[PDB]
Amino acid sequence: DAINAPVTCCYNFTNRKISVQRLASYRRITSSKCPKEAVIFKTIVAKEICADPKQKWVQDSMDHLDKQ
Ligand SMILES: [K+]
Ligand SMILES: [K+]
Ligand SMILES: [K+]
Ligand SMILES: [K+]
Ligand SMILES: [K+]
Ligand code: NA
Ligand SMILES: [Sr+2]
């Protein structure tokens, strides 16, 4: 269940863009406990990075990853 599940949020967004070749996947932050809308990219070396879904590169990267 989710009632007592911990919730993961984003507070800081990466300043710099990440090339598609370095991205393995993403997930969205849905929880209304979180301060703002966010995307977490997991890179090809499993590092997790907060990114702002308002930014266009973030949107396009998400679409690309969705396809493969
Ligand atoms: K300069
Ligand atoms: K220039
Ligand atoms: K191209
Ligand atoms: K212009
Ligand atoms: K494209
Ligand atoms: Na140059
Ligand atoms: Sr640039």
Author numbering: 3 to 70
Lines from the paper:
To gain a better understanding and to obtain structural details of how natural protein targets in the L-configuration are bound by non-natural oligonucleotides in the L-configuration, we crystallized the L-protein·L-oligonucleotide complex composed of L-CCL2 and the L-oligonucleotide part of NOX-E36. The structure was solved applying single-wavelength anomalous diffraction (SAD) and refined to 2.05 Å. An analysis of all contacts including symmetry-related molecules using the programmes Coot and PISA clearly shows that the complex is a stable dimer of two CCL2·L-aptamer complexes, which are connected through interaction of two CCL2 molecules. The NOX-E36 L-aptamer forms a heavily distorted hairpin structure, whose exterior shell is rod-shaped with a length of 4.5 nm and a diameter of 2.5 nm. Remarkably, the loops forming the target-binding site are interconnected by two base pairs in parallel strand orientation (C4-G22 and the noncanonical GG N7-N1 carbonyl-amino base pair G5-G24), forming a mini pseudoknot. A protruding patch of mostly basic and polar amino acids of CCL2, that is, amino acids 17–24, inserts into this pocket. The bivalent ion Sr2+ interconnects three residues (C9, C11 and A12) belonging to the binding region of the L-aptamer. The L-aptamer binds directly to Arg24 and Lys49 and thus shields an essential part of the CCL2 receptor-binding region, blocking CCL2's interaction with its receptor CCR2. Since the L-oligonucleotide forms at least three hydrogen bonds with each of the amino acids Arg18, Lys19 and Arg24 and one hydrogen bond with His66 and Lys49, respectively, almost the complete GAG-binding region of CCL2 is covered by the L-aptamer.
CCL2 (Monocyte Chemoattractant Protein-1; MCP-1) is a member of the CC-chemokine family, a group of small secreted proteins of 8–10 kDa that regulate leukocyte migration in the human body. CCL2 acts as a strong chemoattractant primarily for monocytes, but also for memory T cells and natural killer cells. Whereas other chemokines are able to bind and activate several members of the chemokine receptor family, which all belong to the group of G protein-coupled receptors, CCL2 binds with high affinity almost exclusively to chemokine receptor 2 (CCR2)2. Spiegelmers are chemically synthesized L-stereoisomer oligonucleotide aptamers, which are biologically very stable and immunologically passive because of their non-natural mirror-image conformation.
